[PDB]
Design an enzyme around this catalytic site. Sequence first.
Site, short mmCIF file in Angstrom:
data_model
loop_
_atom_site.label_atom_id
_atom_site.label_comp_id
_atom_site.label_asym_id
_atom_site.label_seq_id
_atom_site.Cartn_x
_atom_site.Cartn_y
_atom_site.Cartn_z
CE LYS A 107 41.64 -46.62 13.99
NZ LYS A 107 42.46 -46.14 12.85
CB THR A 145 33.53 -42.15 10.80
OG1 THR A 145 34.58 -41.24 10.46
CG2 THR A 145 32.19 -41.45 10.62
NE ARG A 148 32.65 -40.09 21.58
CZ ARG A 148 31.87 -39.58 22.53
NH1 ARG A 148 30.77 -38.91 22.21
NH2 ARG A 148 32.19 -39.75 23.80
CG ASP A 207 40.42 -38.55 5.39
OD1 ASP A 207 39.97 -37.48 4.93
OD2 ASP A 207 40.02 -39.04 6.48
CB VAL A 225 41.71 -42.77 19.70
CG1 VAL A 225 43.17 -42.76 20.15
CG2 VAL A 225 41.63 -43.21 18.26
C1 LIG Z 1 41.88 -42.32 13.94
N1 LIG Z 1 42.82 -41.92 14.98
C2 LIG Z 1 43.93 -42.65 15.17
O1 LIG Z 1 44.15 -43.61 14.45
C3 LIG Z 1 44.90 -42.28 16.19
C4 LIG Z 1 44.74 -41.33 17.13
C5 LIG Z 1 45.84 -41.14 17.99
C6 LIG Z 1 46.03 -40.23 19.07
O2 LIG Z 1 45.06 -39.36 19.47
C7 LIG Z 1 44.54 -38.32 18.76
C8 LIG Z 1 43.38 -37.73 19.24
C9 LIG Z 1 42.81 -36.67 18.58
C10 LIG Z 1 43.38 -36.16 17.42
I1 LIG Z 1 42.46 -34.53 16.45
C11 LIG Z 1 44.54 -36.75 16.95
C12 LIG Z 1 45.13 -37.82 17.60
C13 LIG Z 1 47.22 -40.23 19.76
N2 LIG Z 1 48.20 -41.06 19.45
C14 LIG Z 1 48.07 -41.94 18.47
C15 LIG Z 1 46.90 -42.01 17.69
S1 LIG Z 1 46.46 -43.05 16.33
#
Ligand SMILES: CNC(=O)c1cc2c(Oc3ccc(I)cc3)cncc2s1
Lengths: 345, 268
Positions: free
Chosen positions: A53, A32, A30, A147, A36
């Site tokens: 997402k 801004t 979660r 970022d 996800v």
């Molecule tokens: C803005 N976040 C994203 O665009 C994405 C989060 C993920 C993910 O989950 C995550 C959950 C927490 C974290 I800290 C990092 C990745 C697992 N696989 C792909 C993606 S693409």
Amino acid sequence: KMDYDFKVKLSSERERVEDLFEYEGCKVGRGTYGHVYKAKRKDGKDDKDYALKQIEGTGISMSACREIALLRELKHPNVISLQKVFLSHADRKVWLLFDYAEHDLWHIIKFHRASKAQLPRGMVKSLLYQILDGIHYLHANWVLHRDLKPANILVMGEGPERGRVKIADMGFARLFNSPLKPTFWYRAPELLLGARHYTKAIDIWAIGCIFAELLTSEPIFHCRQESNPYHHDQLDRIFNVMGFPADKDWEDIKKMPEHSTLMKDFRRNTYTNCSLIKYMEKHKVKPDSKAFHLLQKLLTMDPIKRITSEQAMQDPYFLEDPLPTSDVFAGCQIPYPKREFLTEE
Amino acid sequence: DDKAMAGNFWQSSHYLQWILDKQDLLKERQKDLKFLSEEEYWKLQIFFTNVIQALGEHLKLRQQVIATATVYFKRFYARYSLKSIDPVLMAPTCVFLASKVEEFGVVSNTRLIAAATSVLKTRFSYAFPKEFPYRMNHILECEFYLLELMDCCLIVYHPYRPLLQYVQDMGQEDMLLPLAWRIVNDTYRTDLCLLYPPFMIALACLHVACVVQQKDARQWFAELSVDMEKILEIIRVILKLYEQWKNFDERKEMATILSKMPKPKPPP
Ligand SMILES: CNC(=O)c1cc2c(Oc3ccc(I)cc3)cncc2s1
């Protein structure tokens, strides 16, 4: 006003995210950006984990638009790959589909830092090489990340991409490419002194920070948290680590909008026995290692004296044993916990 | 200049998906040629190219954004009939969406609607009796359809950049660029951007510019490694455009041509 027949035909053909994917209660991120979810194909027997997402807000915002625009084109093994875009007309929400990354550097570094109460030999080096590989691909396409931080250096878990780095969450929308239009541990000193525009060098600084953090398990420019870009304590931390730049180190520093503010606040002599070398020596990193010399080239104060991602990839560090591997875990069993779901309201 | 993806054309969605076959395009066009002649269809396309240009100028958008919005429009109707969505609605939607692919400033909702309303009455009252009838919620709705139906292909390559490099290479910026640039602009009144890589269109426009200005550039053109046959095809389309332009009076003709358009069927 549309053609009725056109409308019901498109409605009938439209792939709907809630029809195709199971993700109820499987939120993993979660922020801004939005939400996800870990998702699985309801139909096609993929047994493949996906990341869904849901972008923050409604309609297609400049942020949403640019993210889709660029992800629609970018293709590289170390940059997270957009699989599909769903547009939900009813609630006007945008959904982006990605392959699912079980791991990320924030959690991997955290796991190690807790263990004070990098195990495969070349993992650190492999991670860095792949990060550099991915950023170089972006930079060669004139795309800045803007970022970069451990939390969006993803790493694939078990599966055909086991241990592959995926750069994610690119800062695709910044008004006038400006930092000044709406922690700072990974921010380059020029940002903190009022730089007007993101640059390649600013991404490279962040990679340097990440490399140091991988070597030590500690954020090198750790500082207290919370419009104006000047942040005293973050600069103080950088100087406490790096030392205070001489004129010859960063001749153009005089051109920074906050230079006079820096002068008003900081005396060179405060940091006379401070250096990256002493910092890394305290965290058991040998200053004569190839690792250290490359780190020093990423963490250069003056952005124009900072190494480029391509020059970094050619560093003899990566020619020294152990060599970088496609799988950063190098066959070894992954000890890291899988992601926990968020049931918060 | 937004140089994102600038060297990536040969791996781009533009190249891989939106360089179409001339025959497939002509075949998809048939359904609308039940209502309009080929000539009238072209005149319509010219007309809305001009509408998009006027909207963009009104909103102070750089030529590149306007060109992008123009291609969205062309791509949409290359695939779907004029009756699927009112082009009067589509045109400002294309401008709006294109403007969001850039990050140097934003078009607010009121400014987009106000611009559509104002441009149509002051510049295009010869084609349109009534004031702009759509509100912003229609634009937003259309925008979703447009994005979906372009398969989210937003990055578009244009002839302006390679043209700049070519005239620089020639060392003839002062003499040739203004005219060649203007001819690039004119090529958007045709299907060329759906059929050819933009550098080829740049070269064709530079060539015509050289001819108009009696500048001999045969040796320079020879030193290039390009299919010159293809360039000649493009040049012929450009020459044909100017003859149509001469014989076309869009102010006298467009109300008639618009009435002939197939119109969106309402729900029962
Ligand atoms: C803005 N976040 C994203 O665009 C994405 C989060 C993920 C993910 O989950 C995550 C959950 C927490 C974290 I800290 C990092 C990745 C697992 N696989 C792909 C993606 S693409």
